[PDB]
Amino acid sequence: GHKSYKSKHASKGALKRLYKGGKPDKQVS
Amino acid sequence: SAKSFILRKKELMKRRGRKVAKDSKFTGRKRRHRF
Amino acid sequence: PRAPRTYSKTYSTPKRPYESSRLDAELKLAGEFGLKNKKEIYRISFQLSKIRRAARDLLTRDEKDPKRLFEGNALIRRLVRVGVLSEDKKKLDYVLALKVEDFLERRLQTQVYKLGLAKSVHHARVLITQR
Amino acid sequence: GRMHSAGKGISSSAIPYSRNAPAWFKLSSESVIEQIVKYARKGLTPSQIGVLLRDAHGVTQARVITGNKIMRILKSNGLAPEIPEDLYYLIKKAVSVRKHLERNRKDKDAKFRLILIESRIHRLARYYRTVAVLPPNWKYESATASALVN
């Protein structure tokens, strides 16, 4: 087999293989 | 599957070369019924 | 609002409580002196460590420093008068090589046994507590 | 290495271990001084004057023969220019590449080298107005430097 690509956050090409297949925050005073 | 795990690692330390006690029929039992 | 009466612990449990070498070493001490619990060895090994630690920081200090001369001769006087050292080892380099059994030898129940009067080490203890 | 590139060349000149006037020269001391101020009156540049003595008149270097450097000789006799030697030449290069740059709009490489030259001007200028040679602002802007060179 081949050595895989590695990154901490998934690459945009790899999200396209996956994905294609509001209340704002509050800081309490 | 607790008995399967306790035996599986035990002969591994034969090959690693350390002391380990020889077994009997308490190997995979709850030694203590709990609180 | 009265002043808080100061207190401090006089014993320290070991960091490694389960070692077969030391567990047999302390049990040997307990049987031959008749010690009720292992705190008695813990207490001696606490104050022995305090004596060695104090004398160790004096030895980093140079010669003829009056802090070393005053505190050092005070520590030699206190151990000899109790009896832990002999009269021929009155130097700071020998108090580092003290042993736990030296302190236990100077106890009362150990000393009353060495002076007759007991016929066994456990009889020495139970005689003393009966006043 | 270099200031603005990845070169690391060590070509230089080696001043000899003889701080005093070699024997075969023995011409004079004051005669080169009147030679120096004669060449400065022609309109020359203090590097060009020093290189032309040793190519022609055998002056090994003007620091040892005269006792003073060439800048201090010209300043004593009042022939010094307004801006110094090298700061003048940096502007003269920066003007010419900028005149080149307006002629060729799509020269991306001249645009980069102009940034390098103008950066090298500012670092030199901050040195001179620190040692109080220029007026204490002297404000190098792009347009007026064309007038400053001619």
Binding site: - | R15, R16, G17 | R52, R56, L59, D93, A97, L98 | -
Partner: protein
């Protein structure tokens, strides 16, 4: 009865050399182990670890046993050996052979002043072999050996009494921990303390002056 087979066997058979200081000062390369049995007695022997390791073949399975043994008498002399043998009994015998062959002096010192039969190491010294670092720090009297039980047994065997032993890395490996400690106390003698700054009398390496009776028969 041991039959001498090397040149150094003739050196010890006539008994013209008795102390280990002469052979170790020039650091003579020693090939055989039998000259130390006939010269230095009292070597205490302790087997450290025995394990089976396997070798996969085309059809069958060939196994062997790897044993590590550390040997010292009681003081200043220690050796560690590595040996893989076909049987557990021969691994002990061949393990001691290579361990005694790898003997090295240990240079002791004092934590404080230089009085009364040195108890500890001289200098801070380290040893590393494959991401296992063992550091040894000298300790005063009564401090004992504060070390790993294998290293404590190794240091008890070498002849030291007062050692601090701080360690780094994934030191769960036993065969790397021992030889890292072995090369550390091996590095202690390689260190040059200024007490040895006086020039040596330059011995003549007496192998040559006794070569008339140490040559071939």
């Amino acid at each position: 009865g041991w039959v001498p087979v090397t040149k150094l066997g003739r050196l010890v058979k006539a008994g013209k050399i008795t102390t280990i200081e002469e052979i170790f000062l020039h650091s003579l390369p020693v090939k055989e182990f039998q000259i130390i049995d006939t010269l230095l007695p009292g070597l205490q022997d302790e087997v450290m670890n025995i394990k089976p390791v396997q070798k996969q073949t085309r059809a069958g399975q060939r196994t062997r046993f790897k044993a590590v043994v550390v040997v010292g008498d009681s003081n200043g002399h220690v050796g560690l050996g590595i040996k893989t043998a076909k049987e557990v009994a021969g691994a002990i015998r061949a393990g001691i052979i290579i361990a005694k062959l790898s003997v090295i002096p240990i240079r002791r010192g004092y934590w404080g002043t230089n009085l009364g039969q040195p108890h500890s190491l001289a200098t801070k010294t380290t040893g590393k072999c494959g991401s296992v670092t063992v550091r040894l720090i000298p300790a005063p009297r009564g401090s004992g050996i504060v070390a790993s039980p294998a290293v404590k047994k190794l240091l008890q065997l070498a002849g030291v009494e007062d050692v601090y032993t701080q360690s780094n890395g994934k030191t769960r490996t036993l065969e790397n921990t021992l030889k890292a400690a072995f090369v550390a106390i091996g590095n202690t003698y390689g260190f040059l303390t200024p007490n040895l700054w006086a020039e040596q009398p330059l011995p003549v390496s007496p192998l040559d002056i006794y070569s008339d009776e140490a040559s071939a028969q």
